[PDB]
Amino acid sequence: YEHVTVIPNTVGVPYKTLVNRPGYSPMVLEMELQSVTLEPTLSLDYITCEYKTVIPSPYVKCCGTAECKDKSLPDYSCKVFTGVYPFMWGGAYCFCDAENTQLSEAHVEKSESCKTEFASAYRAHTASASAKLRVLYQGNNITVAAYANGDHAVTVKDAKFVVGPMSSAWTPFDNKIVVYKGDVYNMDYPPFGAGRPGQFGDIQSRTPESKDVYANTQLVLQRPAAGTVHVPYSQAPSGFKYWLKERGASLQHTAPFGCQIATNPVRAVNCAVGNIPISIDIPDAAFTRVVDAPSVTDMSCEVPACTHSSDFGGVAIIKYTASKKGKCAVHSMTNAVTIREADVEVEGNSQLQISFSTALASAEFRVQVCSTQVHCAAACHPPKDHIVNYPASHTTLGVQDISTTAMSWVQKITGGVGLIVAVAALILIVVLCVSFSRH
Amino acid sequence: TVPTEGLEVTWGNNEPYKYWPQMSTNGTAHGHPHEIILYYYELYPTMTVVIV
Ligand SMILES: *[C@@H]1O[C@H](CO)[C@@H](O)[C@H](O)[C@H]1NC(C)=O
Ligand SMILES: *[C@@H]1O[C@H](CO)[C@@H](O)[C@H](O)[C@H]1NC(C)=O
Ligand SMILES: *[C@@H]1O[C@H](CO)[C@@H](O)[C@H](O)[C@H]1NC(C)=O
């Protein structure tokens, strides 16, 4: 026997469904879900980190001319200066007082620290989904886990469950993301080979194990100071250090729909969007014929109290006479009222109690116990508590859901105006007809 | 202020708080006509004015 239902994607709220087949006793199931996870697919473009500058000892040639050649190293620079006269602690270094030169050079390499402190840029693609579900079945609590699509089934106590697919394709991630030690940011990083001297991406590498490094920092050599041996230079500061101090809030705090983020692997959980279909397959051996089940023949209903608050603020008493000892299922026949109990124990001639919640100002509903029905009605009052720490257990109301007193007043006013229009119309018709015919 | 969908608040290194509104009125859905209008106005201000 196949059964299909749809449950909204609301974590922490139980729902109930009724399954029956003619000739056999009905069953009521209760379901509640605990977690939903989405997982994207990632691809790596490049990583960034800090840079190091290497400067060897300078070469000084007095009363001769120095020269240098080009090299293939990144950001290589070379210059020759004239007119130097260096000193040391013991006196002037070389005999010649004129026509001296100095040679300076430098280049840029990748820092050793890049093995621990780095950031990576990813491209995102279509995500998968999974869910964890709790089921109350025949008085026992069981748990299942499955993929949120039609390609997986789980069997527990000789019953099969299939979940999914999801009704919505909304995903909190953009096409370009950046990940750093647990934080995920949305950022349109520049393409490889097109960096800027003082921004994110000034140094780029394909992978921590690569030898080929790109950089576009500024590096200019300057003239040395009189009497001093040194190599002054001007260089733009590292962009990576600046980003860390100005990066702002991550998606964990700004994302909509209450989503939460994890990074190992990248995931998003508990996003309150859409609904999830479920299909169940129950074997024939689980059903009992109505000739063996107990029956109830005479019932009536009274409702001594109702407050239409977010919690179970209603109570009802039902009278019954039962044919023999056994159990019955209880289910509501309306959408505006939810009943907490799943089953009852019945014996002899007695009464049972149930509780319910509703948003209606005036409530009418039917209740079914062991395949027979009663009618209940009552008026409800408002609560006085402004704020609570939990979501409501009931649905919203529509435009037609108004009190009986309001409806009565509407009919009286509309009828009065309609009557006066009809009378005026009748007067005109007789006058117009007679004048036509009299001529 | 607390909207219908609820508010989330975090302070320091502690855990977040969550709040939801609940219905409350000073009027009533039963009795005199002018008391009925107040009941609905306090719950759905925009729709009440337009319909009337
Ligand atoms: C721990 O160190 C390894 C390399 O030494 C690095 O790959 C990893 O990201 C570090 N873990 C954390 C949490 O910083
Ligand atoms: C386990 O089943 C009992 C009824 O037998 C129920 O009261 C209880 O809430 C269930 N456990 C959970 C975690 O809901
Ligand atoms: C109702 O009247 C009380 C009087 O104390 C006031 O505090 C409250 O704001 C009024 N409105 C509601 C919705 O309770």
XYZ file of C-alpha atoms and ligand atoms in Angstrom:
533
model
C 0.000 0.000 0.000
C 1.479 3.334 -1.124
C 0.962 6.660 0.658
C 2.129 10.125 -0.438
C 2.117 13.331 1.633
C 3.797 16.752 1.702
C 5.363 18.289 4.826
C 6.600 21.905 5.053
C 10.294 22.571 5.676
C 9.904 23.740 9.283
C 12.518 22.341 11.673
C 11.290 21.464 15.157
C 7.541 21.157 14.481
C 5.709 17.794 14.386
C 3.150 16.921 11.727
C 0.616 14.097 11.464
C -0.883 12.176 8.546
C -3.744 9.683 8.285
C -3.445 6.419 6.337
C -6.399 4.091 5.807
C -7.767 1.439 3.468
C -11.404 0.269 3.325
C -12.085 -2.818 5.422
C -9.183 -2.307 7.850
C -8.503 -0.144 10.889
C -6.784 3.212 10.227
C -3.311 4.209 11.393
C -1.918 7.649 12.261
C 1.778 8.500 11.819
C 3.741 11.404 13.316
C 6.877 12.852 11.700
C 9.427 15.476 12.741
C 12.692 16.492 11.066
C 15.910 17.619 12.742
C 18.447 18.829 10.147
C 18.829 19.751 6.468
C 22.233 20.289 4.818
C 23.310 21.679 1.433
C 26.792 21.093 -0.004
C 28.259 22.896 -3.053
C 30.964 21.765 -5.480
C 34.202 23.783 -5.474
C 37.134 24.390 -7.832
C 40.421 26.166 -7.040
C 41.842 29.109 -9.001
C 44.760 30.395 -6.886
C 46.001 31.237 -3.378
C 47.585 34.350 -1.864
C 50.013 35.081 0.981
C 52.886 37.361 2.065
C 56.056 38.252 0.146
C 59.753 38.549 1.033
C 62.460 40.894 -0.292
C 66.055 39.676 -0.739
C 68.993 42.116 -0.802
C 72.624 40.914 -1.050
C 75.740 42.762 0.058
C 76.545 45.707 -2.247
C 79.610 45.814 -4.487
C 81.658 49.027 -4.513
C 84.335 49.781 -7.108
C 86.345 52.961 -6.668
C 88.190 54.645 -9.563
C 86.654 52.136 -11.984
C 83.264 51.645 -13.610
C 80.770 48.917 -12.688
C 78.111 47.351 -14.911
C 75.418 44.696 -14.589
C 73.302 42.393 -16.750
C 69.624 41.467 -16.862
C 68.160 38.416 -15.126
C 64.892 36.487 -15.349
C 64.023 36.740 -11.644
C 60.744 38.441 -10.640
C 60.918 42.222 -10.149
C 64.644 42.345 -10.878
C 66.218 45.807 -10.639
C 69.794 47.044 -11.037
C 71.374 50.505 -10.933
C 74.842 52.078 -10.788
C 75.618 55.234 -8.790
C 78.648 57.528 -9.003
C 80.440 59.795 -6.553
C 80.585 57.571 -3.452
C 83.180 57.926 -0.679
C 82.437 55.331 2.016
C 83.831 55.271 5.548
C 84.350 52.504 8.101
C 85.175 52.563 11.810
C 88.889 52.606 10.976
C 88.958 55.260 8.247
C 88.271 55.588 4.546
C 88.032 52.257 2.763
C 89.831 52.767 -0.534
C 92.765 55.006 -1.568
C 91.009 56.729 -4.489
C 89.063 59.897 -3.630
C 87.246 60.140 -6.971
C 85.461 58.226 -9.741
C 83.995 55.588 -7.411
C 80.842 53.600 -8.183
C 78.356 51.407 -6.313
C 76.172 48.552 -7.596
C 72.809 47.666 -6.012
C 70.263 44.954 -6.822
C 67.191 43.230 -5.380
C 64.370 40.837 -6.275
C 61.182 39.396 -4.754
C 60.494 35.816 -3.598
C 57.644 33.963 -1.838
C 57.474 33.881 1.961
C 58.023 30.682 3.937
C 54.971 31.422 6.128
C 52.591 30.725 3.205
C 52.301 27.099 4.397
C 50.194 28.161 7.408
C 48.703 31.630 6.749
C 46.923 31.815 3.385
C 43.571 32.339 1.668
C 42.021 30.485 -1.269
C 39.558 31.471 -4.003
C 36.882 29.017 -5.167
C 34.255 28.744 -7.890
C 30.895 27.303 -6.806
C 28.515 24.924 -8.596
C 25.219 23.071 -8.027
C 24.720 21.701 -4.504
C 23.420 18.374 -3.186
C 21.067 17.920 -0.229
C 20.355 15.456 2.582
C 18.110 15.285 5.643
C 17.598 13.487 8.961
C 14.090 12.464 10.050
C 12.384 11.107 13.171
C 9.266 8.926 12.904
C 6.853 7.667 15.567
C 5.675 4.265 14.327
C 3.522 1.813 16.314
C 4.510 3.437 19.599
C 8.280 3.328 18.984
C 10.715 6.120 18.122
C 12.852 5.336 15.067
C 15.296 7.455 13.077
C 16.213 7.531 9.387
C 18.689 9.369 7.179
C 18.545 9.694 3.404
C 19.574 11.769 0.412
C 17.104 14.454 -0.672
C 16.323 12.877 -4.040
C 14.629 9.831 -5.515
C 17.742 7.633 -5.716
C 17.805 6.356 -2.118
C 15.529 4.296 0.123
C 15.804 3.256 3.775
C 14.052 0.237 5.300
C 13.177 0.213 9.012
C 10.857 -2.392 10.565
C 9.893 -3.652 7.083
C 8.775 -0.206 5.876
C 10.395 1.793 3.065
C 10.847 5.575 3.017
C 11.816 7.863 0.126
C 12.352 11.615 0.560
C 12.778 14.450 -1.918
C 13.372 16.157 -4.288
C 13.233 19.661 -2.776
C 10.782 22.203 -4.191
C 13.275 25.106 -4.286
C 16.708 25.722 -5.805
C 17.657 28.754 -3.682
C 21.272 28.684 -2.469
C 22.982 31.265 -0.212
C 26.313 31.095 -2.103
C 27.375 33.213 -5.072
C 29.571 32.064 -7.958
C 32.784 33.433 -6.382
C 33.651 32.797 -2.720
C 36.717 33.211 -0.497
C 37.439 30.966 2.505
C 39.712 31.782 5.456
C 39.866 29.776 8.720
C 36.130 29.226 9.054
C 34.850 32.441 7.449
C 33.273 32.574 3.982
C 33.043 35.840 2.033
C 31.462 36.780 -1.290
C 34.072 38.681 -3.305
C 34.694 39.277 -7.025
C 38.418 38.565 -6.954
C 40.529 39.633 -9.964
C 41.560 37.106 -12.628
C 44.957 35.428 -12.630
C 47.695 37.666 -14.007
C 45.860 40.977 -13.477
C 46.702 42.106 -9.940
C 47.233 45.535 -8.411
C 50.194 46.945 -6.464
C 48.361 47.514 -3.182
C 45.158 45.454 -3.201
C 44.069 41.842 -2.793
C 45.826 39.664 -5.356
C 49.193 41.418 -5.684
C 50.916 38.017 -5.339
C 49.317 34.902 -6.844
C 50.206 31.212 -6.960
C 48.324 28.236 -8.378
C 49.050 25.845 -5.488
C 51.273 25.734 -2.368
C 53.651 23.375 -4.194
C 54.203 25.576 -7.266
C 57.520 27.207 -8.135
C 56.119 29.818 -10.559
C 55.046 32.994 -8.745
C 53.445 36.188 -10.073
C 53.873 39.595 -8.440
C 53.356 43.223 -9.456
C 54.690 45.255 -6.546
C 56.554 48.527 -7.071
C 60.281 48.553 -6.337
C 62.605 51.512 -6.967
C 66.217 51.881 -5.819
C 67.371 55.136 -4.227
C 70.691 56.943 -3.893
C 72.707 56.073 -0.760
C 73.464 58.628 1.929
C 76.886 60.265 2.114
C 79.420 58.284 4.135
C 77.119 55.292 4.707
C 77.093 51.840 3.102
C 73.459 50.744 2.741
C 70.747 50.008 0.177
C 67.643 52.220 0.544
C 64.534 51.414 -1.479
C 60.829 52.229 -1.797
C 58.196 49.488 -1.976
C 54.411 49.283 -1.743
C 53.111 47.566 1.419
C 51.611 44.089 1.287
C 47.928 43.920 0.398
C 47.154 40.761 2.379
C 47.879 42.378 5.756
C 45.481 45.225 4.910
C 42.558 42.937 4.009
C 42.670 41.149 7.379
C 42.032 44.444 9.205
C 39.140 45.590 6.965
C 37.301 42.451 5.805
C 34.116 42.999 7.831
C 31.335 40.578 8.714
C 31.043 37.083 7.242
C 27.975 35.279 5.875
C 27.299 33.670 9.278
C 25.889 37.000 10.501
C 24.417 38.550 7.327
C 22.781 35.648 5.468
C 18.974 35.581 5.127
C 16.480 32.915 6.226
C 18.462 32.081 9.370
C 21.073 29.967 7.592
C 24.211 28.783 9.390
C 27.579 28.174 7.739
C 30.362 25.610 8.165
C 33.606 25.368 6.221
C 35.130 21.862 6.566
C 33.629 21.058 4.075
C 31.659 24.186 3.108
C 28.010 23.686 4.081
C 24.815 25.606 4.819
C 22.183 24.307 7.240
C 18.640 25.038 8.442
C 17.495 27.334 5.623
C 13.701 27.699 5.979
C 12.587 27.498 2.339
C 10.124 25.263 0.499
C 8.651 21.868 1.341
C 9.572 18.188 1.017
C 7.445 15.294 -0.322
C 7.554 11.865 1.332
C 6.438 8.413 0.130
C 5.798 5.392 2.378
C 5.265 1.684 1.608
C 3.518 -0.377 4.314
C 3.282 -4.195 4.094
C -0.016 -6.068 4.246
C 0.881 -7.835 7.521
C 0.602 -4.551 9.472
C -3.198 -4.245 9.081
C -5.955 -5.586 11.353
C -9.499 -6.295 10.173
C -12.362 -4.183 11.535
C -14.125 -7.319 12.804
C -11.423 -7.703 15.480
C -10.881 -4.046 16.421
C -12.995 -2.424 19.156
C -15.835 -0.048 18.321
C -17.520 2.987 19.891
C -21.226 3.594 19.284
C -22.375 6.710 21.189
C -20.531 9.998 21.730
C -21.039 13.660 22.599
C -18.711 16.646 22.956
C -18.313 19.627 25.290
C -15.524 22.218 25.392
C -15.255 24.021 28.764
C -12.379 26.388 27.887
C -10.483 27.906 24.963
C -7.708 30.480 24.669
C -6.321 30.961 21.155
C -2.683 31.395 22.136
C 0.397 30.001 20.395
C 0.403 27.007 22.769
C -2.092 24.225 23.570
C -4.669 26.330 25.393
C -7.797 24.250 24.749
C -9.401 21.266 26.478
C -12.321 19.043 25.425
C -14.262 16.190 27.051
C -15.788 13.395 24.937
C -18.173 10.690 26.173
C -18.018 7.182 24.715
C -19.316 3.643 25.109
C -16.888 0.970 23.885
C -17.544 -2.651 22.941
C -14.309 -4.041 24.438
C -10.857 -3.107 25.699
C -8.424 -1.799 23.102
C -6.860 1.257 21.503
C -8.174 3.840 19.035
C -6.564 6.408 16.749
C -7.536 10.087 17.001
C -7.408 12.542 14.092
C -8.861 15.963 13.283
C -10.953 16.540 10.158
C -10.037 20.226 9.718
C -6.909 22.253 8.995
C -7.450 25.113 11.467
C -7.184 22.937 14.613
C -4.313 20.640 15.630
C -4.669 17.890 18.253
C -1.686 16.831 20.361
C -2.673 13.222 21.069
C -1.962 10.351 18.682
C -4.047 7.632 20.371
C -6.299 6.812 23.332
C -7.137 3.773 25.453
C -10.850 2.932 25.689
C -12.788 0.617 27.995
C -16.417 0.275 29.038
C -18.425 3.462 29.576
C -16.339 6.520 30.478
C -14.927 9.768 29.059
C -11.648 10.905 27.487
C -9.765 14.221 27.411
C -7.807 15.840 24.558
C -6.089 19.195 24.074
C -5.798 21.385 20.985
C -4.720 24.809 19.732
C -6.262 27.182 17.194
C -6.158 30.782 15.976
C -9.911 31.133 15.355
C -12.057 33.580 17.307
C -14.941 31.096 16.935
C -14.095 27.441 16.373
C -16.073 24.582 14.844
C -14.496 21.240 13.984
C -15.035 17.489 13.747
C -13.053 14.746 15.485
C -12.813 11.098 14.429
C -12.179 8.265 16.894
C -12.267 4.650 15.673
C -14.122 5.591 12.448
C -16.943 7.681 13.976
C -17.337 11.453 14.211
C -18.667 14.197 16.513
C -19.272 17.951 16.218
C -17.793 20.464 18.698
C -18.079 24.254 19.020
C -16.956 27.011 21.407
C -15.929 30.666 21.686
C -12.325 31.638 22.495
C -10.665 34.601 24.270
C -7.345 36.423 23.620
C -4.129 36.039 25.642
C -2.247 38.785 27.495
C 1.419 37.776 26.901
C 3.214 40.035 24.429
C 6.394 38.066 23.606
C 7.362 34.374 23.702
C 10.525 32.389 22.942
C 9.092 29.768 20.568
C 7.266 29.504 17.220
C 3.536 28.929 16.948
C 2.074 25.449 16.472
C -0.811 26.476 14.182
C -1.518 27.908 10.734
C -2.629 31.414 9.776
C -6.186 32.592 9.116
C -7.847 33.781 5.925
C -10.192 36.572 4.917
C -13.294 34.402 5.433
C -12.402 33.435 9.034
C -14.484 35.940 11.001
C -16.722 35.669 14.041
C -20.407 34.785 13.830
C -21.483 38.108 15.365
C -19.587 40.081 12.712
C -21.202 38.018 9.943
C -24.709 38.703 11.276
C -24.165 42.478 11.257
C -22.881 42.370 7.666
C -26.007 40.615 6.375
C -28.369 43.111 8.031
C -26.709 46.235 6.600
C -26.346 44.832 3.066
C -29.957 43.620 2.972
C -31.364 46.996 4.002
C -29.675 48.896 1.174
C -30.579 46.232 -1.391
C -34.272 46.428 -0.498
C -34.590 50.172 -1.128
C -33.019 49.771 -4.583
C -35.471 47.033 -5.602
C -38.490 49.126 -4.570
C -37.366 52.144 -6.608
C -36.827 49.946 -9.678
C -40.343 48.477 -9.471
C -41.946 51.938 -9.446
C -40.138 52.959 -12.642
C -41.122 49.808 -14.563
C -44.888 50.220 -14.025
C -44.814 53.925 -14.954
C -42.771 53.346 -18.115
C -44.942 50.443 -19.297
C -48.271 52.216 -18.724
C -47.143 55.382 -20.517
C -46.023 53.330 -23.524
C -49.236 51.283 -23.652
C -51.607 54.187 -22.923
C -50.511 56.002 -26.092
C 11.212 46.246 17.444
C 10.102 42.659 16.792
C 8.662 41.837 13.338
C 6.292 38.971 12.589
C 9.155 36.719 11.455
C 11.113 37.253 14.685
C 14.379 38.896 15.710
C 17.835 37.472 16.454
C 20.226 39.283 18.811
C 23.857 38.542 19.695
C 26.121 40.224 22.258
C 29.829 39.595 22.711
C 31.012 35.987 22.668
C 27.711 34.602 24.000
C 24.975 32.637 22.231
C 22.188 34.358 20.267
C 18.692 35.089 21.554
C 15.437 34.616 19.634
C 12.067 36.336 20.131
C 8.654 35.929 18.490
C 5.524 38.079 18.825
C 2.200 36.897 20.200
C -1.314 38.209 19.593
C -2.854 40.635 22.081
C -5.788 43.052 21.889
C -7.795 45.356 24.137
C -11.040 45.005 22.169
C -13.318 42.058 21.551
C -14.821 40.114 18.650
C -18.191 39.877 20.436
C -20.656 42.571 21.426
C -21.117 46.125 20.204
C -20.144 47.069 16.613
C -17.524 49.689 17.539
C -15.666 47.229 19.784
C -15.436 44.720 16.912
C -13.688 47.239 14.636
C -11.031 47.902 17.289
C -10.314 44.167 17.678
C -9.395 43.696 14.009
C -7.650 47.063 13.555
C -5.061 46.231 16.230
C -4.167 43.005 14.365
C -4.220 43.992 10.653
C -4.055 47.813 10.505
C -3.532 48.158 6.738
C -6.298 45.828 5.520
C -8.886 47.133 8.006
C -8.689 50.729 6.750
C -8.756 49.827 3.041
C -11.744 47.462 3.258
C -13.894 49.836 5.329
C 47.460 23.636 11.067
O 48.714 23.680 10.368
C 48.622 23.168 9.033
C 50.027 23.157 8.482
O 50.993 23.172 9.525
C 47.665 24.040 8.223
O 47.518 23.461 6.933
C 46.302 24.121 8.901
O 45.457 25.041 8.219
C 46.449 24.543 10.365
N 45.160 24.503 11.036
C 44.567 25.585 11.547
C 43.233 25.356 12.188
O 45.084 26.702 11.490
C 9.713 8.537 22.264
O 8.396 7.987 22.344
C 7.655 8.467 23.474
C 6.347 7.711 23.491
O 6.559 6.318 23.667
C 7.472 9.980 23.370
O 6.799 10.452 24.531
C 8.824 10.668 23.238
O 8.642 12.060 23.006
C 9.626 10.056 22.093
N 10.952 10.649 22.022
C 11.198 11.827 21.440
C 12.625 12.284 21.461
O 10.308 12.494 20.922
C -4.171 47.963 25.991
O -4.325 48.765 27.160
C -3.211 48.656 28.059
C -3.562 49.460 29.289
O -2.633 49.230 30.340
C -1.932 49.136 27.374
O -0.829 48.931 28.249
C -1.705 48.384 26.068
O -0.612 48.958 25.360
C -2.957 48.440 25.199
N -2.782 47.670 23.976
C -2.608 46.343 23.933
C -2.460 45.747 22.567
O -2.567 45.651 24.948
